[PDB]
Amino acid sequence: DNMLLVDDAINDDNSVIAINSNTMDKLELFRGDTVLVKGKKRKDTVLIVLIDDELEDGACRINRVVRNNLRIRLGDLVTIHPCPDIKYATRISVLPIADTIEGITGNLFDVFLKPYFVEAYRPVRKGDHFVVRGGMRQVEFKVVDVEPEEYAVVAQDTIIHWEGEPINREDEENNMNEVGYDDIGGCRKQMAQIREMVELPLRHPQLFKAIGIKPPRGVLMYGPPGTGKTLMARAVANETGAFFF
């Protein structure tokens, strides 16, 4: 029972997901428990479980920040599992987003993060983002590094490092290619042919062991220039999740 509906979270916590009481009973959880949620492609995080009666069966509440992190919109579907092994991050380094430090002065740490980390125990994972409302503005921060890795909890014993250059929001997508199947159209048979020969030997290598064959290695795509061959290969590689060179 790990497939649930997505709903907007009225609360203003970047690491809180609400579940129905019946849903909580089915998954055998408790109020405040931290659980791991995996969305589209290979993006996943951990959120604090909350009990909310108004939530319908098989539904969950996540804010826009969580939706951006998980690459999903309202009403999408994710996979949720218990995360009882989560430890407390002993040392975390995080830096603000450049566009979020426009004109903001002073000790940004004390102003924004310290109220945000006063015994909050907010789950954190590598590459995550979280927004904090300080004063009359809002500042976003990113999980640059954590110890122990990967997913942990920020507690009082944790050492917070806010030293480093601002994180420009542009290069997260302009300089990085994170394109899934949603960015390909007009070629589905070709995508099926590529996937059934790329993902299957890698995602499920035990099948070919079971049937005692050596799956084909090479693949040669070709066509008129500008038909998206590079884009198709990039999308397949990103969806597979294997080290892409």
Partner: protein, 59 residues
């Protein structure tokens, strides 16, 4: 003696410190050897350093 890497002008300038920092050269929130890469060791005009850990011949 101590002149084999750990003496005067090797503690004024953390030569071992430079080598170790080059080893663990990352943001990230003793022994000196030549297993790695060089790191810029800059000294002002008029200073000569002879304290590099010796190497001796092929024997």
């Amino acid at each position: 003696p101590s002149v084999l890497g750990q003496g005067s002008m090797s503690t004024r300038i953390d030569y071992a410190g430079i080598a170790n920092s080059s080893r663990n050269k990352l943001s990230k929130f003793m022994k000196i050897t030549f297993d790695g890469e060089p790191a810029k060791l800059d000294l002002p005009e008029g200073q000569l350093f002879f304290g590099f850990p010796m190497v001796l011949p092929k024997e």
